[PDB]
Amino acid sequence: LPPAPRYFQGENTAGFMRPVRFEGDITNLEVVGEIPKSIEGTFYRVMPEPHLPSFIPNDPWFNGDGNISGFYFKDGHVDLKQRYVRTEKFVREAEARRSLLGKYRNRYTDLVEFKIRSTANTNIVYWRGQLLALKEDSPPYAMDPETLETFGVYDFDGQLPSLTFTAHPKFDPVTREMVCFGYEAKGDGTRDICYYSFGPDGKIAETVWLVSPVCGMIHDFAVTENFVIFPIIPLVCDVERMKQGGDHWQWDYSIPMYIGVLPRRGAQGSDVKWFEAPHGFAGHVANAFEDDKGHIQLQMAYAKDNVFFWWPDANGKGPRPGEVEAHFANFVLDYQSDKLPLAEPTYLVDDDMEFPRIDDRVATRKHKHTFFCIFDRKPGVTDFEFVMPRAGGGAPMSNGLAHLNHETGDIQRYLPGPRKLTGECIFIPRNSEAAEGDGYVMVLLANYEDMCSELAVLDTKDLTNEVALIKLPVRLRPGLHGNWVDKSDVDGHPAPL
Amino acid sequence: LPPAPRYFQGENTAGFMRPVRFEGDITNLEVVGEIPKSIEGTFYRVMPEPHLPSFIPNDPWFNGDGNISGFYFKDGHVDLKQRYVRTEKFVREAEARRSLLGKYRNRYTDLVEFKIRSTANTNIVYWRGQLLALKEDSPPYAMDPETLETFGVYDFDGQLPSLTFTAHPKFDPVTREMVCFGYEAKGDGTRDICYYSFGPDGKIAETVWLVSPVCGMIHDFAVTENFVIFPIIPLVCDVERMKQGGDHWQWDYSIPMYIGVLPRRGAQGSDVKWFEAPHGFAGHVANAFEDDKGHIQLQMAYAKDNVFFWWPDANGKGPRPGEVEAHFANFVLDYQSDKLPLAEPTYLVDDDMEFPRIDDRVATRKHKHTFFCIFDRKPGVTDFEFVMPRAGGGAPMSNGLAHLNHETGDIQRYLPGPRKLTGECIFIPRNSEAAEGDGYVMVLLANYEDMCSELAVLDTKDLTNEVALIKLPVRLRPGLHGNWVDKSDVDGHPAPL
Numbered sequence A, B: 001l002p003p004a005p006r007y008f009q010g011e012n013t014a015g016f017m018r019p020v021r022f023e024g025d026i027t028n029l030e031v032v033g034e035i036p037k038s039i040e041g042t043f044y045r046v047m048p049e050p051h052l053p054s055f056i057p058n059d060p061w062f063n064g065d066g067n068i069s070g071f072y073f074k075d076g077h078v079d080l081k082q083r084y085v086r087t088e089k090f091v092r093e094a095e096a097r098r099s100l101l102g103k104y105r106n107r108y109t110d111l112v113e114f115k116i117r118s119t120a121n122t123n124i125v126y127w128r129g130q131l132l133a134l135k136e137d138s139p140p141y142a143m144d145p146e147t148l149e150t151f152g153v154y155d156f157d158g159q160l161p162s163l164t165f166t167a168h169p170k171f172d173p174v175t176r177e178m179v180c181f182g183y184e185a186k187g188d189g190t191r192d193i194c195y196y197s198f199g200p201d202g203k204i205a206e207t208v209w210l211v212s213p214v215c216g217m218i219h220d221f222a223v224t225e226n227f228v229i230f231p232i233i234p235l236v237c238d239v240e241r242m243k244q245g246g247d248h249w250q251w252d253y254s255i256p257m258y259i260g261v262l263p264r265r266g267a268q269g270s271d272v273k274w275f276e277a278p279h280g281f282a283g284h285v286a287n288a289f290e291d292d293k294g295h296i297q298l299q300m301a302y303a304k305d306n307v308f309f310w311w312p313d314a315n316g317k318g319p320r321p322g323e324v325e326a327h328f329a330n331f332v333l334d335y336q337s338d339k340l341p342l343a344e345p346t347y348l349v350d351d352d353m354e355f356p357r358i359d360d361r362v363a364t365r366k367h368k369h370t371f372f373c374i375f376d377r378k379p380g381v382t383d384f385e386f387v388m389p390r391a392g393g394g395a396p397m398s399n400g401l402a403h404l405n406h407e408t409g410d411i412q413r414y415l416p417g418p419r420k421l422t423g424e425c426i427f428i429p430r431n432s433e434a435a436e437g438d439g440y441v442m443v444l445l446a447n448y449e450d451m452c453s454e455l456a457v458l459d460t461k462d463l464t465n466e467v468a469l470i471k472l473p474v475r476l477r478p479g480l481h482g483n484w485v486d487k488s489d490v491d492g493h494p495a496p497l
């Protein structure tokens, strides 16, 4: 077998990116300031964190074992619980005491045959009394919200019709449905997309099979009252390339950014319309909604080149690290239109941004508040000379959060400091009668001075001030998505406005 | 109630001394070099580590909640498990989410009434299939060696005759007895010492009540074939002082360092002879044995002034931090002599030293190898300008280990480097046929450059070279005692040579 290294080497596991790999508890976290005493619930987040050194050099960040953190809040006190998802990969590698799964989404490089290749490392959501740890090449893994024990791969009582479950399901705050899909839904290289939904009682509602014009990456999607929308990143999969040891994904400069629109209820596969946006990268969706005219307003991060530069085109063509900016775009789509090309989007702000969140009480409906990560290169915002040598590589950087009020156009920015960077934020309603976007924002910080993590709590009335700073004595390696589960929401999701 | 701080403040919890307070697992630790594949067993260590900020300012290091680390070795792989002892203090404070126990060994300052005040933070030993977590003001707490679960306060099937159980019991390698005692054995300020022993079947053997000439601290003791030996530190307890909120211990410059000698078997309390060594501090015992003449050779760390400078005399008189050195002394004692004063000891080496260990296969018999911590002020051994600002306070410093061969007088020294300091080492026999002192040494390092801990593995054939360096991604705060439990030893202790 390729030899198993006994310590981590390479930029993707150096500095702040060095895996810690701890599971367990740290109760009664240290707090500077004061956590509002009325906050009650749990912030769950997932990070890729390789449990064992990979036999693949420079294995991307996206390929690390999912480790779940829960921060449990009550009466101004907070406890941390942390535990790895017991994926098939995790369990078999722990038994062997070495890495066995190979390149990102390429089973032809695995040292043993896996049934499920999930690292369950991308999102962690609440559904019907369980956590679902999500990875877009696989079904979810179900976990206990209290103990973080893994129950196992989850198939929705035998109803899951797809091999794949997106990391970005949407929760309709009025119908209480979970709206889902999977791409490559019949296996590696397939153009099959399975669109499906579950009612609040757990029964499958929609199931529609459709065909993507290319086998392209559909990382996120959008849901409105009457439509579902599938933006395709121009990364394309060729299984023959994979069989020779090549990458699952390869950029294609010759295609548009396709945007599929399907009717939300009762459609067939042939009802999808593949609109053609100008070539670019489909980033995360903030939210989509239908306006007065029935036109879809789709608000999402959008870049003009390949954000995932390590997967360049067939000739190795692509940008360099830190070159590509993504911007907060608004695309207008009309399902009734037969004109497939779309105009350049309008842009809501100037900032280089990503990881947008809204008040999920208006998900699928008109929203007027967005919170998002920003990366500002203006001199002095980040002390790059100090941070870069301690940061390692492989992951995006954010040096602030922004809050946009869409009615007024006011933007507030939270800057944690010159030697700190942020993860994705969560929004917590002040209480069940709070106005849209009124309450608290939490965000995990990487402090490069201390080489520790911190959890900042902010009030939306003034996003520039930390109400509390929870000081962890360990690093939580840069991670992906997270969600708030409020103690007053019996089904784990907030009530509609 | 005195207000409960929400983050740690003060020098005793700053820098490398900042509590981490994590419990759980880190498997498959990173290793540089190669752990000898034949090593099989577990290294257990205990550290004081306050679980909650104290309401007592500058609470000493000795007063922190005991947290147990186990490093489990097999086939060149090593896993960490870590867990707090579930003492009455730990459990009641965790329930209240605040500190409740007050000053070190002063129940009159507690905010609630405790039955048992143990922090179980001083030693962790193996006995008859359980771990015993030891603290000299209390009985032991029994724990599971595999899971580190706490079973509860342990009374030896109702046989424990004392309120107090020493942190330094001795294991006789020939008889397989555990030889114990407790001082202040009838309560705060009592001069009662209870000497007692257990046979390998768990039945109590000896129980002798004796009287100390003063209520002084008897931290360690020594055991030979026919005698037990009690060296008294000139810290003295006055319960009336404690009732007014004062310190349990106060130095007394007017007394000798008493050394009690009692016959090991069949004695009465009045058989003890209280020899009088020159005034000084009774440090840890390496080992004691009877020579050809039946005279006791007692080898121990010995200083000329109060090592515990924060507990000065009645008028506040005593040394400053880092001024007192302890040296490796040999006292000669003759139980038949009626001459109570003893000569100044001889010294085995020059180094400022402490935490001596021997090959416990010769415990209570003649030994010819000692391993110990040293603190060398020779310029450049420690880069004090770098280390001191990151170190915090409250704990002793060691910047090397030394191995003395007593037959030849050769000394080898392991220096982990200018920005590292060490804990107490353990010795592991190479195999069951190894000569005395031949095998491996392990020691936990504090790395002040990385602010992480490391576990060094050394071969006694060349103590200057690390065979392996196990790299933890967290800090283990400076700790107290630790022990090896070899997998090949049925009762957990090595066979006699």
Ligand SMILES: Oc1ccc(/C(F)=C/c2cc(O)cc(O)c2)cc1
Pocket: A062, A063, A121, A122, A135, A136, A219, A282, A283, A284, A301, A354, A396, A480
């Ligand atoms: O297995 C995978 C595949 C993709 C991702 C992932 F987070 C993609 C992604 C990351 C970004 O920083 C922005 C963005 O729009 C998308 C994670 C795991």
Ligand SMILES: Oc1ccc(/C(F)=C/c2cc(O)cc(O)c2)cc1
Pocket: B062, B121, B122, B136, B219, B282, B283, B284, B301, B354, B396, B480
């Ligand atoms: O409650 C307690 C009381 C004492 C100790 C302790 F380890 C004392 C000690 C520490 C030294 O550095 C040298 C030495 O000779 C003795 C630990 C906990």
Ligand SMILES: [Cl-]
Pocket: A086, A148, A149, A150, A151
């Ligand atoms: Cl589990």
Ligand SMILES: [Cl-]
Pocket: B086, B148, B149, B150, B151
């Ligand atoms: Cl327990």
Ligand SMILES: [Fe+2]
Pocket: A122, A167, A168, A219, A284, A481
């Ligand atoms: Fe995502």
Ligand SMILES: [Fe+2]
Pocket: B122, B167, B168, B219, B284, B481
């Ligand atoms: Fe000790």
